[PDB]
Structure formats: structure tokens, C-alpha cells
Write a protein that binds this ligand. Sequence first.
Ligand SMILES: NC(=O)c1ccc[n+]([C@@H]2O[C@H](COP(=O)([O-])OP(=O)(O)OC[C@H]3O[C@@H](n4cnc5c(N)ncnc54)[C@H](O)[C@@H]3O)[C@@H](O)[C@H]2O)c1
Ligand SMILES: NC(=O)c1ccc[n+]([C@@H]2O[C@H](COP(=O)([O-])OP(=O)(O)OC[C@H]3O[C@@H](n4cnc5c(N)ncnc54)[C@H](O)[C@@H]3O)[C@@H](O)[C@H]2O)c1
Ligand SMILES: CC(C)[C@H](C(=O)O)[C@@H](O)C(=O)O
Ligand SMILES: CC(C)[C@H](C(=O)O)[C@@H](O)C(=O)O
Ligand SMILES: [K+]
Ligand SMILES: [K+]
Ligand SMILES: [K+]
Ligand SMILES: [K+]
Ligand SMILES: [Mn+2]
Ligand SMILES: [Mn+2]
Lengths: 350, 350
Amino acid sequence: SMKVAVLPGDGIGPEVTEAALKVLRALDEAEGLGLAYEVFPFGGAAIDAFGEPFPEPTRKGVEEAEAVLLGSVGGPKWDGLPRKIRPETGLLSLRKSQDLFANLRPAKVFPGLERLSPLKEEIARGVDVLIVRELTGGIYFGEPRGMSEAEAWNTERYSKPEVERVARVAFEAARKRRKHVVSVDKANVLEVGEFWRKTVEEVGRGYPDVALEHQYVDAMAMHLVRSPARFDVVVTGNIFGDILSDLASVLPGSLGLLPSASLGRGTPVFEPVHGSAPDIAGKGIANPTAAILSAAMMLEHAFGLVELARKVEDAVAKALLETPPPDLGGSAGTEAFTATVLRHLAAAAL
Amino acid sequence: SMKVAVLPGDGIGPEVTEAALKVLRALDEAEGLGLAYEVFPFGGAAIDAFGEPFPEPTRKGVEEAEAVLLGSVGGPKWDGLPRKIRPETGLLSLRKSQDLFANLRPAKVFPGLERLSPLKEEIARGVDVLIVRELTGGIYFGEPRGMSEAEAWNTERYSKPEVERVARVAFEAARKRRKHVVSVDKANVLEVGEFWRKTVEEVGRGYPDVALEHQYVDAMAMHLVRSPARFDVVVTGNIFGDILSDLASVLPGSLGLLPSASLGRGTPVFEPVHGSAPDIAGKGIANPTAAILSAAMMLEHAFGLVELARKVEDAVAKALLETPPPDLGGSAGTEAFTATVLRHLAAAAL
Ligand SMILES: NC(=O)c1ccc[n+]([C@@H]2O[C@H](COP(=O)([O-])OP(=O)(O)OC[C@H]3O[C@@H](n4cnc5c(N)ncnc54)[C@H](O)[C@@H]3O)[C@@H](O)[C@H]2O)c1
Ligand SMILES: NC(=O)c1ccc[n+]([C@@H]2O[C@H](COP(=O)([O-])OP(=O)(O)OC[C@H]3O[C@@H](n4cnc5c(N)ncnc54)[C@H](O)[C@@H]3O)[C@@H](O)[C@H]2O)c1
Ligand SMILES: CC(C)[C@H](C(=O)O)[C@@H](O)C(=O)O
Ligand SMILES: CC(C)[C@H](C(=O)O)[C@@H](O)C(=O)O
Ligand SMILES: [K+]
Ligand SMILES: [K+]
Ligand SMILES: [K+]
Ligand SMILES: [K+]
Ligand SMILES: [Mn+2]
Ligand SMILES: [Mn+2]
């Protein structure tokens, strides 16, 4: 069995999630996976129907599933709502309630696809980075937070156990990869960066088989574009991970490519890094690669189906060469691009 | 009368500041500018002699000067000091004591120098971006702040007047440029981002001749590398401006290139974006472009010598064509590169 709660959300979310469901249904028919999914209202779609972005039946669906496949939430229609019911607060709540503290956001340039990057070929060649972002703490969830007429405030707060457990994930990921971690902070200005750095250094002592370096967040952002092949695992807190991972999209060449997994105590969540892209929603052009590769991360991390996840990545890469979507300089919209993916997947099987 | 307080600082700070001084001296001799400068201890060097990074004689010099030419502060020698007296806190105290709230950090790709970027030529071509970063508020200065054994906290916060005065600077800069402002925040997750967005939008109603757009900081980091030519003025808070301005160095191709001005109520300060670069300090290689162009920004913003600022910018461009430094793939050390800038300046003098 493979029990999946599907949260398509808003804007391009449903468009890309549908493309990802087509790939999963195809795998399920080919492989006998026992795929069982149900679609649940989430974000702005949930607000329009229930008045809150993460309503009861959706919380229940998440809770009872083995994995969540998520699209994206948000858009101009919901601009101005009180924060406690905004579409993005629904995704914060989902993460927090499942204690999904480890956000894995990989960025790789597939051999032969260096041409898709805005970076010169020789700079993009061989890039394979993994961002391990702390997802349930920091300024996203810190108290106090608020606003008056005169001012507004938010609190970047981390405890020792929160830093420890995300650091452990990064070192364990680096063990499985190329044995390098760079930890990222603003320790020269912020108490919380200092605390972060010391704690990651403490956890590092238990992994003498892994190399540990530290970088200030400003320099890291530069180094990640100028010398990306240098980095293996990058560990950082909630807001800096959010920023470095959208930035990491310029390595393979588009934010339409980047998948993610959110792992922790509860039901794991797999979603594109990208948002709901209201500028192109409803035009049938959204690149579904990030949703499709998030379904591949789900197969690997939630279901242990490592080889199927790899066939999906391979058919995506082929489709990227054959029929690029518009965000990568081609003209294949969502359904045509997914169709190319499905033909490569059928060619690899049938 | 051109009274300048010079704060060389630590690591490559004195190296590149000396080169900027050679350029200012050649201008003073050729133009009779009444240049009168004095060199003051600052950062780590001030800590070792006086016990604090912004000591009394340097405070007095800054106060009595019409402008500050500042190098860089910091390095492993001062790691572990109480925060109150860290080299970087000396730079925070300089900014705050002079109420320099507007940090101007420009990034341009000069025509014919696109090949210096790690981005493909067609992407770097025509780039001309000005980041206007709020410099005296936000998480850098927010209270409460602290660290125990169990946790650490910092407060990101902004008042209405602090947002307003930096937004006004951004719109007034846009009016002199291409009349486009993008304001950058994280309003979908942070109260402070929403307060920022609302306030910039309110200020923008006075400037309806300026297009105003808003981007979340993660999507902005991505857009700045993929589509840099689309941006004119970018306004943002303290930490986001820190990050995006290091990232902006990949457009012309090196952090060794980017100058900045800090403007407000008190004595304006001009310094490179880059740090003290302890990994190359004392090797005679540091690119002095950023310091030299910071002296140009000083001539423009503090002294109204716009024509002389442009001549310096033109001699720097030609030096980068003829004898690039090692951070840009060439072999000219700091002194050799400066000598090329001086040769071009002396030709322009004719
Ligand atoms: N996980 C999420 O639900 C998530 C993440 C980020 C943003 N958001 C929400 O998304 C909305 C848009 O915000 P944004 O513009 O900053 O982020 P965005 O990630 O939605 O879009 C960023 C840029 O990339 C383009 N883009 C993104 N995904 C793409 C795809 N698959 N194909 C082609 N182009 C793509 C968009 O058109 C836009 O130009 C906002 O409401 C934001 O709050 C949601
Ligand atoms: N304005 C300031 O005084 C300032 C700004 C940033 C960092 N710092 C401090 O500087 C020190 C180093 O921090 P960092 O490594 O993150 O930042 P950095 O900006 O000093 O160096 C970042 C990278 O760019 C290279 N680089 C920087 N300037 C260069 C130049 N002019 N020419 C050639 N290469 C150059 C460096 O060697 C290094 O690889 C720390 O003590 C940090 O706190 C100070
Ligand atoms: C929807 C929002 C909370 C989110 C985040 O900032 O985590 C978005 O950029 C993302 O990257 O998921
Ligand atoms: C010295 C430090 C406070 C500084 C900053 O973050 O402002 C550094 O990155 C810089 O960019 O000046
Ligand atoms: K998403
Ligand atoms: K479950
Ligand atoms: K500096
Ligand atoms: K003064
Ligand atoms: Mn994001
Ligand atoms: Mn910086």
C-alpha cells in the first residue's frame, strides 16, 4: 500500500500536482504499487470553502496518510487577510503540527543539461548540492511577533535541541553523499548565529568522517553562484534556507525544477520549492518538473522505492533535453512536457 | 575643503584603502580639491590599542570630518570577544551614532566587461542595479537579544518612521534612474514584512510616476541572478540587503568590485561591500576596485563632484579591461592594478 494525501492548493499548484499524479498513476499501473490517494482542500482553496487554510478534514487526511504530496498555496486573491488565516499560515501549521523540522532541497545539474543554466557551462558542470533547512523553528515560528500602528516585530529564536536535530540530519546526509557540510549563519552580528555555529560545531564532533566549514549567509549566497561545485550539504536555519534554495534554482536553471521533502516526527510532505506562480496560473505553461521530482522524493523517502525515484529523474532529464518548457527557453506547456516524461518512462519500461 | 576621516580597519582593509588614497591624492593634485584626511584606528586594530572597535579619537575624527573613507573590519584574531566590543559591532556603532539609515550598494556591468561575470554574457549585459538597504534598524539592532546555554534570540523589528525614510530615499533614487522600485520582504510569513510592504506602498502613493513592485526575498534572490537587467532600484531591510548585495557581486563578477555609501543625518561613510578577506590579507592581491569606487561615491555624494566620480569609474573600467586582478582571472596585484587606474586617470587629466 501507498496511502497519499494530496494537497494541490492554489494557482499553478493544482496544474503541477495533476502532472505529478499522472506520473504516479502510470507507475502504479506499471508496477502494482497499490497507490491510494485522496485530494484535500488547502491554502486559498480551503479558505474559500471553510474560512481557514488547513481545515479539519485536511488535518485528518494528513494525519492518517503515509505521505503528503503538496502543490503550492497563496495568491493575490487572498492579499490582506488576517495572518492567522492566510494561505501560507496553513503550510506553517501543517509543518509544525507534523513536526517536520528537516526540509531537504536538492539542486543538481544533470550531465548534458548544463546548457539550461544561466551560469557558464563550466561553472554549472557537476553541481550537486543538498540544502538541509531547519523548518519548524527560527523567525518563522518565534514569539513574540506582532504589529501596532507604530511598529512590527518577529523573533528569531532557536533552542539547542532544535539546532542539534537538524545538524544531525545534515551530517547523516553528508555521510551518504560527499562527506562535506557547510553551516550558514550571521554569527558576526547575531547572538542566534553564534549559538547556531557553536551547536553545529558540537554535533560535528560526532562525525569525524565529515568535513565541516562555516560561512556568513551574505558570502555563502555569492559562493553558491560563483563556485557551486564546491558544496555538498548546506545546513542552515529557516529563513536563510528559504532564500538559498530559491537561489539554488539558478544552478540547473529554473525554479520550476526544484523538488523538496519535509521530514520529521509525523507525516512526511513532498512539494515543489516554488510557489503558486499567479503570473502564469491557468495558462497551461507551468513547468511540472519540481512536482514530478517531489513525487520521486516521496517514492524514495516515504516508500523506500529508490530505483523508481531514479527512473523518474532520468525520464525528467530526457524530457528536459527533448521538449524544454518555456521557463527554460522551449515551448512545451505542462501537459505536453508531462507527456514527454511519460513517453521516456514507457520507453525505459515497455 | 574636503575633510575626510580614513578608517582602514583590518585584513585587506588597509591594502585597498591605501589604493583608494592613491587615487584621491592624484585627483587632489590634478584638481586642487583641498583634500585633508587623517587616518584613525578602527575595528580589530582599535580593539588591540584602545580596547574597543570605535574608540574616542576615532569617534571625534568622524564627527569633525565631512566624510569617512572606511576599509573593512574583522578576522579570526578577534573571534570569541564579547559582542559589545567585536570589530563588527564597531561598524554597527559608527552607522547608528551618525544615523546613517540609507545604505546605497550599486552593481553595474560596464559595457564590454560582461565576460567577467560567471553568468552568460547576455544575462550580465546592461545590468545596472541599486540596492537601497535600511542600515540602522531591523534584527541588527532589535531588542530583546541574548543567548543562554539553552537558546538564543534576536528581534527583527521596524518602526513606521524607519521604513518611511528609507523608502523615500529609494523612490528619490529611482526618480534619478529609471523610475522603477522593487521592495523586498517576507510578508507572507513575517508581520514585519507585511508592515514593511504596507508602509512602502503608502510612501509610493506620493511617487505615482515611479513603478512600484514587491517581491518576497527568496524569489528576489533568484530573479536578481536570472533576470538582473529587469531591476533598477531595490529597497529592503538590513539583513536582506546584506545578503542580496553580496549576491549582486556575481553580476559584474566579483565581490572585489562593489562599493557602498552610507547616508543619513551624520557624517556619510563610504566603504567596500566586501569584508576583511583574511584568506588573502597580506598577499598583495586584493582587488581595490570596491575601495576606489567607494572614494568615487564619496566624491559624488559627500562632495558633489559627480564628474570626478565618473572619471574614476571610467579609469577603473579600463584597468579591468587591461590588467584584471586575480579574482577576475588576471595577474595584477593590488599595486599593479592601482597603477593602471592611475595611468588612465592621468590620461583623462589631459
Ligand atoms: N510552497 C508554497 O506554497 C509556496 C512557496 C513560495 C511562494 N508561495 C506563494 O506563491 C505565490 C507567488 O509568490 P512568488 O512569486 O514569490 O513565488 P513563485 O515561486 O510562485 O514564483 C517565482 C517566479 O518563478 C516563476 N515560477 C515559479 N514556479 C514555476 C514553474 N513551475 N514554472 C514556471 N515558472 C515558475 C513564477 O512565475 C515567478 O516568476 C505567493 O502567494 C507566495 O506566498 C507558496
Ligand atoms: N564592511 C566590513 O567591515 C565587513 C563586511 C563583510 C565581512 N566582514 C568581516 O570580514 C571577515 C571575512 O568575512 P567573509 O569571508 O564572509 O567576507 P569577505 O567579504 O571578507 O570575503 C568573502 C570572499 O570574497 C573574497 N574577497 C573579498 N573582498 C575581496 C577583494 N577586495 N579582492 C579579492 N577577493 C576578495 C575573500 O577572499 C573571500 O573569499 C569577517 O571577519 C567578517 O565579519 C566585514
Ligand atoms: C509558503 C511559505 C511558508 C514557504 C516558506 O517560506 O517556507 C515558501 O517560500 C516555501 O519556500 O515554502
Ligand atoms: C560588519 C557587518 C555589520 C556588515 C553588515 O552585515 O552590515 C558586513 O556584511 C557588511 O556588509 O558591512
Ligand atoms: K510548493
Ligand atoms: K501518518
Ligand atoms: K567594508
Ligand atoms: K560631520
Ligand atoms: Mn521560498
Ligand atoms: Mn555583507
